[PDB]
Structure formats: C-alpha cells, structure tokens
Amino acid sequence: KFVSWKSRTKYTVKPVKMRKSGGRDHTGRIRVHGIGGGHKQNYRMIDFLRFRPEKEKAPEPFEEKVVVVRYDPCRSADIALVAGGSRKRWIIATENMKAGDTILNSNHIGRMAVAAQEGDAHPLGALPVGTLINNVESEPGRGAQYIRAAGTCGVLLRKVNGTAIIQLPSKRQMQVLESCTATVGRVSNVNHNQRVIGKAGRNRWLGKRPNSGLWKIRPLPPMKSYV
Amino acid sequence: AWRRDIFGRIVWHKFKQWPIPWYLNKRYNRRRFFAMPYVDRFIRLRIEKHARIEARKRSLQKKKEKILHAKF
Amino acid sequence: GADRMSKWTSKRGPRTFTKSRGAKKTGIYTSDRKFVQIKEMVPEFVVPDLTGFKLKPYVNYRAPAGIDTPLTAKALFQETVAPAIEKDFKEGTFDANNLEKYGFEPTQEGKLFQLYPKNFPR
Amino acid sequence: PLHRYPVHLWQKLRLRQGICARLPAHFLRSLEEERTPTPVHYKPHGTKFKINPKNGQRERVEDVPIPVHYPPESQQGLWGGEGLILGYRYANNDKLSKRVKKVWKPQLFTRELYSEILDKKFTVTVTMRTLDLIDEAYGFDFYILKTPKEDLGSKFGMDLKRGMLLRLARQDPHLHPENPERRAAIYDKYRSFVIPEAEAEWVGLTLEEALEKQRLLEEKDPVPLFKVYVEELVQRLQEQVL
Amino acid sequence: AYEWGVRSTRKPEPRPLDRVYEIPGLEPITYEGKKHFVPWLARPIFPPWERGWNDPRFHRAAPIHEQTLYKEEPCYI
Amino acid sequence: RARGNEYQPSNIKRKHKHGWVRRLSTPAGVQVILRRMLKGRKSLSH
RNA sequence: AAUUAUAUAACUUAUCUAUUUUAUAGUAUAAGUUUGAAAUUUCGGUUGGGGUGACC
RNA sequence: UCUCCAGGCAUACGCGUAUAACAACUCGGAUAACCAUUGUUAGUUAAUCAGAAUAGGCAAUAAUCACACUAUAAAUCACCUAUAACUUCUCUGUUAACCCAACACCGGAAUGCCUAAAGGAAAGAUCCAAAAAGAUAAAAGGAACUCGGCAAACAAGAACC
RNA sequence: GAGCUACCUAAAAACAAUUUUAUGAAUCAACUCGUCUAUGUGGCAAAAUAGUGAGAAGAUUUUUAGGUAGAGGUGAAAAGCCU
Ligand SMILES: [Mg+2]
Ligand SMILES: [Mg+2]
Ligand SMILES: [Mg+2]
Ligand SMILES: [Mg+2]
Ligand SMILES: [Mg+2]
Ligand SMILES: [Mg+2]
Ligand SMILES: [Mg+2]
Ligand SMILES: [Mg+2]
Ligand SMILES: [Mg+2]
Ligand SMILES: [Mg+2]
Ligand SMILES: [Mg+2]
Ligand SMILES: [Mg+2]
Ligand SMILES: [Mg+2]
Ligand SMILES: [Mg+2]
Ligand SMILES: [Mg+2]
Ligand SMILES: [Mg+2]
Ligand SMILES: [Mg+2]
Ligand SMILES: [Mg+2]
Ligand SMILES: [Mg+2]
Ligand SMILES: [Mg+2]
Ligand SMILES: [Mg+2]
Ligand SMILES: [Mg+2]
Ligand SMILES: [Mg+2]
Ligand SMILES: [Mg+2]
C-alpha cells in the first residue's frame, strides 16, 4: 500500500509536499535504522543540469539572474532561485552568491583558459588547472551528482587530451571528459560543520531516532597452538 | 447466464443494466466468474458430504417401512 | 464483541458509512454537491377511471369457477394468428416474408415496451 | 458410502458427458490418450533384460521416468522437452552424507527462428537441445510438424503447429502472394503433413479452448415460436389441400 | 539529466500480447463470448467504443491542436 | 494496569480486517471462506 | 562441537555470445574452489559442595 | 418540604431498543419498594445539523491578534485558457439511564462549553463488645522507636559522601 | 492475528495561572506517569483503592485511519513487547 511521493513528472518551483518513510520500504519493514518523525518539510525541485538551454532556444552560453538565496530543509547547502528568459528554476548556491547577481552558463569549450568567476558553469575543458569546482557530473549531460553538499569544493588536478582528473572532497581522484560541466567555487554554508546540535531533542527535530541500547582473524593451523 | 463462482459452484447469474459495455466497466471486471485449482478439493468434499446425507435419508426410509409392516 | 449475525444497515457504523434501504434513485448528484431530480426517473402511477365499473373486490359464492387452463403460446397463436393465415392460405395471398402483416415483430428494438429484455416494470 | 467409480476414471467420465461429448471424435482421442514423452533427463535401458552382477542372473529391468517440473514460462517457448529437475543430492556423493535439496536448471537462450510456411521470424526462449532437434529435423517447420505434443511440450509450440497445418490444409494464397511459384514449392516440400481442414482446426487446443470453440459453434438465438407454429400451420394447411 | 517521476509511480506498461496473435492465419479463442475474464483463455482485442450519442455528464474534450481557436502564435495572458 | 479491555470497537477496522472483501482478496482468505461454508457456519465473515 | 551450507561474495573450467590472430572480454546454465547468512544434531560414566586432577 | 454531596450538558466513536406507556410479578436487579425484568402497544420527522463534465497553462515570499519584530526545526483547491452542459430535493443518520472491562464492576474512555441555573444521596432496622481498618485530640518527654525517622508531625529547613 | 502493546506513516487535537538569563528553564493545575506507605489479597479490580509523590511548550501528551507477522516483526536491550 506504500506509494512513493516522488510522483511529480513536471519541473516546477512550487514546493512539493514530502511524505516521510521512517526507514521502511514499500514492503513495510524497517530497512534503515534511526529515521523517524522530525519536522514536516517541503521539497523544492532542484535543477542540477546548470547548462540547460531554455525551450525553443539555441545551445549557446546564456545568463541568469539570481532572485533570492533561500534556506533548504532538504539539504545542508542553501538554494538560490535564478531567473533568465522566461524561466525560473532552483539551483545550488555557491559560497558568495547574493540576490541580484548574474551568473553565466556556457557551452563553449575555451581553447584558452577562461577567467573563473564563482557561480558560473563552464565545461571542465574551459577551466584552468587548480580551480575549485563543485556540482560535477560524471558523464556529459548526466547532471551534477558530486560535490553538491555544503562547503565542499573539488580541485581540478590535471587535463590531458579530452579527459580531466577531479579530486573529490574525500581526496579520491576521479576522471571525466572535459566536456563535462562544473560550477566554479565551493558550495554555500561553508560553516555547516561548525554547528552544535546541543540537545538530544534537536536531533529528533531532524528526523533522527536514537540508537539501539544493545551493546575475527582465524589463526591458521600452525599458529593455532601459539594463539 | 450459467456461471461458475469463485467457490466452485454453478449458479444462474442475473444480468444488470449498464450504460457502458462489459469490457469498459472496471467495477464489473473485478468480479470473478471462475474458480482456481484450490477449489477442487472442496468440490469433492461437498459431493461426499451430500452423498452421506442422501444415504442416511434412504436408509431411514427403509427403517421406517420396517416399523409400518411390523406394526401392520 | 461485535454482532456478526445482525444485518449491516446505515443505522450502524460511523456517520461516513451510508447505504440505501432499497429505494430506487430518482435523480443524479451533480458536481458542486447538488441533487438534480429527473422527472422521467420518478415513477408515474397510471390510474384508470373507475366510474361505471361493475367489478368489485369479491365475487358471489354462487359464481362457478372455471376449469383451470393456463394460457400457452399455442392457445394464444390459434386465437389471434391462425384465422388470418388460414384465410390467406385459402385465398393464396400468403408468403414467409410478410409474417409481420399478421402481427410478428422481427425485433424488439424501437419498441417502447420490449418483451425481451423487459424494459418496463409490472 | 463409496463412489461408484474410482477417482482415476473421473476425468474420462466427464469427457463422456455434456458438452465434452459433443466435441469431435478426433479431438477427444488426443485428450484421452496418454503417451510418455521421449526420455530427456535419464538414460533409457537399452535392453529389457540384464545380468545382475552379484548373483549372475537374468533380471527384468524397467524405465522409470524422472519427474520433471515444467514452469509456466516454458509454455511461451520451444524447450526441447527440457525442464526443471527438483530433487535431492547426497553431499560428497556418498549415501552416508546429508540429503540436500537440489534443482538442476536448463540453460536457456533467446534465438530468432524463421518459419517458411508462416514466413515469419519469431523470438523464442530456447535450449541447445531444441536447436539440435531442429537440425535433426532439417528445419524449424519440420521440427514443429514432426514432433508430437508430448515431446514438443509447449503450448506455443502446439499453437505454431496448428498455424502450419491450417496453412497447408487450405493452400492459403496468403503465403508469399505475388509469387505463386514460391508458394507452391513451399507447400510441396511439406505436402506429407496435409490433413483435413476440420481436423487441423482442433490441433493443440486445450480442453477449455475446445469447449469455448464448441459453445461458439452451437451458439444460437432462440427461434420465435411465432415462426415455428406458422411452419407447422402452413404444412398442415398445405397437406390438406393436396 | 534527472527525470522527474519514479517508474514505480508511473502507469504500468501493458502486458505483452498473447503469442497466438503473432501466428498468421490463426483466429485466437478468447473469453469475449463468455463476457467475463478467465485466466486460461486469450485476452480479446476490442475496437474503440462509441456511445452513438453525446452524454453531457461524460463529455470528453478534444486535444489542444484540434480546438477551433488554436493559433500558432503564442499569446501571453 | 488492568487488562481485559483489549477490544476497542471500530466498525471501519472490523470490516477492513475481517470483512467479505478482505477475505476474498487472497486465495488463503478464500479458502477460509470455503472451510466455513463446508462446516455450515451461518456467518462466513464479519 | 560434528555434519552440511546454488544466503551472499569471489574465482577456475566448460556452455553461449560477440569480436578478435589466436587472444580478449562478457554469461538465463552445469561442474569445481574459496569464503560462511544460516540449518541440523549432541552434551558417556566414576568422582560430600566445588575446583581440580584423575580414573573406565 | 427539609438535610447534605459536587462533573454536568452536548458531540464523536461505540452500542442496537436497554427508549416511552400499559399489563404482569414466573426469570433478571446480588434485598424490598419500584422497575433496568416478562408480555403487548407505541417511537427517532431536516435543502440549513450529519453522511453520500473534460483537456490544457501555472506558482520563490509560513504561523504566532501579523504590525514592529526576531527566529529555526523552515511550516496548506485557487487563478487563467478553451470545450460541454443551460434549472434541482430524492436517499441515509437522529430513541435511551447506552460503550470496553464475564456483572447495574471504587477501573479504562476523545473533543466543545460551562462549575452549579445542571446532576445527585454516604445511613434496610437496631446495638455501642473484642480484634481489625480510618479520622481527630495528647499531661511530662521528644527518635529513648526501628534493620532504617517507616508512618505520622503545630515540621516540610541546612549540609556532605 | 498490530481495535492490546512496540515502532513507524498520513490527517488532526490539547496545554490555565504565575515567574524567567526566553527555554528538552522554574512554580503548579488540567493532563500523562507510577516513587513510597497502608488497605485489598476469590478484591471494586485476573494489578485496584486511599494518601503521598514525578513530568507538566515538549525526546510532551492524546485522537482517527493505515503499515510491519512468528525461520518473523518491533525494541532510547528490560532478551521487553506482538489481544
Ligand atoms: Mg550502547
Ligand atoms: Mg479478554
Ligand atoms: Mg486505541
Ligand atoms: Mg406498573
Ligand atoms: Mg431477587
Ligand atoms: Mg425505563
Ligand atoms: Mg420492558
Ligand atoms: Mg437525543
Ligand atoms: Mg473483570
Ligand atoms: Mg440539582
Ligand atoms: Mg449502617
Ligand atoms: Mg494529630
Ligand atoms: Mg504528647
Ligand atoms: Mg536508636
Ligand atoms: Mg532499641
Ligand atoms: Mg515518612
Ligand atoms: Mg494501531
Ligand atoms: Mg501554559
Ligand atoms: Mg521543564
Ligand atoms: Mg514538579
Ligand atoms: Mg523538577
Ligand atoms: Mg519506546
Ligand atoms: Mg541487559
Ligand atoms: Mg539479563
């Protein structure tokens, strides 16, 4: 009888009502522990393909205007409503975004290095080595999946041929095609890790239930005696 | 029509009036006019249950005739 | 602790539970939560004029009851259809195609009163 | 009390009464007859007698077919009589070890097969045994046509056979139209399998399908008794004139 | 590019057609004559149904492009 | 606390948990009905 | 503890595919090897209370 | 009429005639009177209380007297474009001292209004024993009690492991 | 079999007065719980009564409907709870 709430097909900026799980599945059994209750939250559909040219428009660099930088219940980072043409869409906001700012979204792969302005989306080929990036996408056109948490920045270590090495926030090095799109700068809420929950009740507000109260090398035969 | 219900019996089904044909009516289609294989064991049990009732009735008649002829 | 043997009726259960007592519907509930009664859906009693009628509820005990002969299709056919066909056969003006001339109905569709499926109440 | 007939005869009794009795005689023969399929999962005994090695005496031997489970999915394919063997094994292959549940599964493949009589390519789930059997039969059409119901072991396989047989029986010009010479060649190649049109209709049908078919054949609206009595009246009147 | 609407919530894909339909020249035996579904017979294919008259309570609108006032040029309201 | 009052009547729960439609929804439930029919129960379900 | 252990997870060889000049990759299955989620079964006898040593 | 007591009236869920009158005095109420019992007859009345056309486009801006403010846990069809239809009141709930606890059970039981204008009766009659239970009062003393200031107190303060 | 109980999902509800650095703060009702004592021990009760006590804007309490089922479920682990 469990139907997922993720049943909306059309992108909108209207907040969407979310149903909580509690850690259960469609079967109805707990699959993950520590999830329950919390404050009621609304989902704001984020757009992780920064370079999405508007409908009935050419695939060339375009600009968008930042309406407001909001607080997101569903994320550690903060989101920004950005407007361009006749379209509004939520996006992830970088460290220094402000209302009224203008951000570029470019398809052009610069033969030479492109000056890096935080918040603008360029193909990794355009960027020069060493520039901090966020909201990287593993495959061209896939959509951002990495470095989209609060304060996380990835360095662009190297570019050779049509491939670049991206150092993920965990220091795990990844490689992608330079056609892949990344957003310059680190993600907002750079001080998210400095927060102090302070009391147990605050965690219960965040939908986190308390942990359970419950409290292996095998020697080889030569070593079994000497264990 | 003569139809088999989900319990394995044969019953006369009275039709109803509808504004749409049967294949487009979702309420009607949810009704089942067939029995699955798990019903055959119950079908035999009814036959045997009924056969016992008939056997007892016939025996009792024969016993009752004895009383009549003995009495008269 | 519930009663399993008594009938399920609208008096029982919560307020949300409702069901009919067998009265035929006389209208439709449209959108906006409005009842719209349909004049055609409301049964109309066809009552005859009883002035000058000689039949009363009871009969004389001296009135002889007749031999019971339930009406059959053959009995109806002989009384109504047989004389016409017999007369026409003697004159020779009879053919299979024109059975409708004697009162046959090829189909019940288009009739106000259909014999099968019946479309009128008693 | 007791039932008049043993339980194993109950199916035969039903086929002998009711709408089942009205089914064609040839169709009932297929239902009535029980024939064992060709061995697949066990080696048959070559002889009817062998010498028991211990006592050195001639002993009668019999073939006991292994019980095989045929999943409902197999009815959508052309498995070559293969099925699932649900059984047990002895761990380490010694009688004194544990008895363990074991299921032996056939290796299934999806292949494209072309039927000349139907001139259509089907995608079918198949085993290597079926491909070998088709090779032995010299074509997909021959395999379907030659193989009996028991060995074919597929409702889809039986359905294909009905189509081929009906196509041959009618000499339908729908096969390769505009090339009457090619149509004739195909029909001639498979001429051995031609049977009467009536028989081909009922090939491969299940009992439920047959009953529905027979019900449709005999379905009729009742005759208005007005017509019936008129016919009786006309005949009597006509006879009187004679 | 992320697609909105998880597949589990979408209308389920139609069940595949019975293989008897694939066979040319063969008329499948279906439960149409019965006037009810049965698990062991072929599923009928019904032609689109037309009531033969207009029912206001169950009116169905035409698509946008078939509307009389459909115009190529957008009008911002 | 005092026990014995575990029945907290609710007609919606009763018909949904033990009703006709609930019993016919699964083959196991249909077999429940068949058993009660063979015994001769006056009440097949709630 | 003894017996098992297509729960997973790896591998190897077949099988089946593609390619390949023999190589690669894969894999509706079969047979092995490694892990063990589990399963099944048992708690000999003499020894104040034990511990221990012993004994049959 | 008097004496005294202080959760009452509605709705929801549930219950299913326990409702009311008459007649009975077998059974039921743990006894009578009287009926909650038996039999017969009656009852609960609603357009406002309560239950029960289609296809498109589209949304940044809590609540808290919402103003000032502050905040964080980030918080509820409409409107528009077209299409279609072009005057209607039937059906169902409505009684009660009632439900879940085997009982006319010192128990359990949601919300709104109100705190006596509503709702009720702790004593069948008599007697004034022991033991037992509860309440109040205490000469002198004030923890000498007891495993322990348990319980009670005109006390209800301080401090340390 | 989750109308009890354990946990969860959806939709709802309740919190007076008094102080406060403005809150899993304080005092104390309604409400929730159940510290200690006496009574009761076939009891009013198959866990209650009478006092005395703990929390009482929160990790609070409570209502309606739904969910997870025994080789299992749930568990702020008592091997506690699942009529
Ligand atoms: Mg711990
Ligand atoms: Mg009980
Ligand atoms: Mg409850
Ligand atoms: Mg009286
Ligand atoms: Mg008495
Ligand atoms: Mg009364
Ligand atoms: Mg009475
Ligand atoms: Mg009333
Ligand atoms: Mg009790
Ligand atoms: Mg009063
Ligand atoms: Mg007294
Ligand atoms: Mg005192
Ligand atoms: Mg004193
Ligand atoms: Mg002392
Ligand atoms: Mg002393
Ligand atoms: Mg004390
Ligand atoms: Mg519940
Ligand atoms: Mg308050
Ligand atoms: Mg507090
Ligand atoms: Mg306190
Ligand atoms: Mg305190
Ligand atoms: Mg808990
Ligand atoms: Mg412990
Ligand atoms: Mg312990």
From Swiss-Prot, chain A:
It is found in: Mitochondrion. GO terms for molecular function: structural constituent of ribosome. Transmembrane segments: none annotated. One of its GO terms (biological process) is mitochondrial translation. Keywords: Mitochondrion, Ribonucleoprotein, Ribosomal protein, Transit peptide. Its main location: mitochondrion. This is Large ribosomal subunit protein uL2m. It comes from Mus musculus. The chain holds residues 62 to 297 of 306 of the full protein.
UniProtKB/Swiss-Prot annotation, chain B:
The keyword 4Fe-4S does not apply. GO terms for cellular component: mitochondrial inner membrane; mitochondrial large ribosomal subunit; mitochondrion. It comes from the Eukaryota. The keyword Mitochondrion applies. GO terms for molecular function: structural constituent of ribosome. GO terms for biological process: mitochondrial translation. Signal peptide: none annotated. Residues 62-72 have a biased composition (Basic residues). Keywords: Acetylation, Mitochondrion, Ribonucleoprotein, Ribosomal protein, Transit peptide. It is found in: Mitochondrion. Belongs to the universal ribosomal protein uL29 family. Component of the mitochondrial ribosome large subunit (39S) which comprises a 16S rRNA and about 50 distinct proteins. This is Large ribosomal subunit protein uL29m. The gene is Mrpl47. The chain holds residues 169 to 240 of 252 of the full protein.
UniProtKB/Swiss-Prot annotation, chain D:
Pfam families: Ribosomal_L28 (PF00830). GO terms for molecular function: structural constituent of ribosome. GO terms for biological process: mitochondrial translation. Residues 1-54 form a transit peptide. Keywords: Mitochondrion, Ribonucleoprotein, Ribosomal protein, Transit peptide. It is found in: Mitochondrion. The keyword RNA-binding does not apply. GO terms for cellular component: cytosol; mitochondrial inner membrane; mitochondrial large ribosomal subunit; mitochondrial ribosome; mitochondrion. The keyword Ribonucleoprotein applies. Its main location: mitochondrion. Belongs to the bacterial ribosomal protein bL28 family. Component of the mitochondrial ribosome large subunit (39S) which comprises a 16S rRNA and about 50 distinct proteins. Interacts with OXA1L. This is Large ribosomal subunit protein bL28m. It comes from Mus musculus (Mouse).
From Swiss-Prot, chain E:
It is found in: Mitochondrion. Signal peptide: none annotated. Component of the mitochondrial ribosome large subunit (39S) which comprises a 16S rRNA and about 50 distinct proteins. Belongs to the mitochondrion-specific ribosomal protein mL37 family. This is Large ribosomal subunit protein mL37. It comes from Mus musculus. The gene is Mrpl37.
